[PDB]
Symmetry: C4
Subunit: 43 residues, 4 copies
């Protein structure tokens, strides 16, 4: 069963790398949203 647990650890870390990237992309969306809102506010 150690062969299977080995595959699980590897896949979890691969999927986490993907979620990590997603997290970075979401930060950009927030910053872009704030910029868009400012273009719509008098200043």
């Amino acid at each position: 069963i150690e062969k299977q647990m080995d595959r699980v650890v590897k896949e979890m870390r691969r999927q986490l790398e993907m979620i990590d990237k997603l997290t970075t992309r979401e930060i950009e969306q927030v910053e872009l949203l704030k910029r868009i809102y400012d273009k719509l506010t008098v200043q």
Copy 2:
């Protein structure tokens, strides 16, 4: 296999931190989107 099991548990704790971040950022984004839509729509 206890060593492998420990690795799995720590990856899950790491993943939880990431989901928490995605969840809170998602809220910030949607609230921003609604505000932006309102700035463009007849009130």
Copy 3:
């Protein structure tokens, strides 16, 4: 070790429920984004 694997299955399903909710929320963001873009396009 069955006690630990039991906790892993439960936690994975709990975290997936969270990702499932996130997925639904993201669909809304896309639909909201399309509506915002249309308010900015002549028609």
Copy 4:
């Protein structure tokens, strides 16, 4: 524990499907955000 291990593998496959969706939707959102920002900015 092989039965529990199988449950874990299937949850991971389910999670992957979800991450794939989040990843593709995120792209659609950012491209929309950039287009919206452009519609509001001097070109």
